[PDB]
Design a binder for this molecule. Sequence first.
Ligand SMILES: O=P(O)(O)CP(=O)(O)O[C@H]1[C@H](OP(=O)(O)O)[C@@H](OP(=O)(O)O)[C@@H](OP(=O)(O)O)[C@@H](OP(=O)(O)O)[C@@H]1OP(=O)(O)O
Ligand SMILES: Nc1ncnc2c1ncn2[C@@H]1O[C@H](COP(=O)(O)OP(=O)(O)NP(=O)(O)O)[C@@H](O)[C@H]1O
Ligand SMILES: [Mg+2]
Ligand SMILES: [Mg+2]
Ligand SMILES: [Mg+2]
Ligand SMILES: [Mg+2]
Ligand SMILES: [Mg+2]
Length: 317
Amino acid sequence: QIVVGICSMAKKSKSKPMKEILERISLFKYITVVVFEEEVILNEPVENWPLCDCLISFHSKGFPLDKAVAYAKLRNPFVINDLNMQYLIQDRREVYSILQAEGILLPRYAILNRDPNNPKECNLIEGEDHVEVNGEVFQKPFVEKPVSAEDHNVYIYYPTSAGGGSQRLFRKIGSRSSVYSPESNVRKTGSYIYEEFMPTDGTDVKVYTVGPDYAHAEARKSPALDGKVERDSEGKEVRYPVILNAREKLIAWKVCLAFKQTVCGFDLLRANGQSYVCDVNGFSFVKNSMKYYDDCAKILGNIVMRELAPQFHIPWS
Ligand SMILES: O=P(O)(O)CP(=O)(O)O[C@H]1[C@H](OP(=O)(O)O)[C@@H](OP(=O)(O)O)[C@@H](OP(=O)(O)O)[C@@H](OP(=O)(O)O)[C@@H]1OP(=O)(O)O
Ligand SMILES: Nc1ncnc2c1ncn2[C@@H]1O[C@H](COP(=O)(O)OP(=O)(O)NP(=O)(O)O)[C@@H](O)[C@H]1O
Ligand SMILES: [Mg+2]
Ligand SMILES: [Mg+2]
Ligand SMILES: [Mg+2]
Ligand SMILES: [Mg+2]
Ligand SMILES: [Mg+2]
């Protein structure tokens, strides 16, 4: 039996999408799934972690990525989502740089770094209705993102002609994903990316890859609108159907490969007749789609079989 090991925090390992997909992967005749216990991940040294032939492992808040890398280095499994890239995925500047090297359209942007110790003369000039970041001008509306991709306190600043102030986004709290603030001045402590605001129809497109030739997409109301979350009779956020065009399927192919994340979530903004990547999240499952569960488990099982059946002397086509 080929062992597929699952190494992530329990909140992810025991999530509904994860349990659904793992159940289906276990249906493969020659595959056994082993889920690493959170307590083992945190408290046991890597030498005591279970063995596996294929490792599916991914960082989220509180995950010891250092240990996961050390484990992979030690046991040399077939890695589905590259671990070293997950350091870069935590930094929006690194994400953006990769996207650019790959010829992927993204919002025009500029980085404002503040070395905390440095004599605080930032490369930032602020006007009533714009900012200048290292000489580059962003007219309101513009977007201000913390350089940490884990920091969801993304602000949007409105022009005086729309009444000024700002929209402060955050990781969803029940009925709400953003709130309006009368504050018009940018944040003065921290490092940020400033980007041009891309006009969409009011929805974000969320893309989920399973290898570079499979991508499920769906749309949700942008948090940058008013911030009221739309929920269904079951208390789950309303999603809208999406089919990616040829250019977008290519974007998904590139993102998956460039970031070496077989399973990869990213967001697209459909604006000005094009599609812009504004965020690459790394490992993420589609939630509450049974067809996704079927597809994703079959693809991953097939990836595992194709890669490992030969050395295990197992018949595979
Ligand atoms: O309890 P609620 O409000 O009904 C759902 P949440 O905001 O608590 O979960 C989100 C989760 O948020 P949370 O941390 O609150 O579980 C976050 O995780 P985080 O990035 O670690 O915060 C992501 O989970 P993944 O790790 O699966 O990507 C999100 O997945 P997407 O990016 O939207 O696909 C989840 O959003 P979902 O799609 O479930 O609404
Ligand atoms: N350049 C932009 N133009 C217009 N809207 C934007 C832009 N960047 C971000 N937004 C909106 O702000 C939301 C949050 O931005 P994003 O870069 O996805 O932050 P995040 O904190 O990484 N979110 P998550 O998907 O949970 O990781 C997006 O889904 C868009 O609706
Ligand atoms: Mg099995
Ligand atoms: Mg994540
Ligand atoms: Mg939550
Ligand atoms: Mg996003
Ligand atoms: Mg993100």
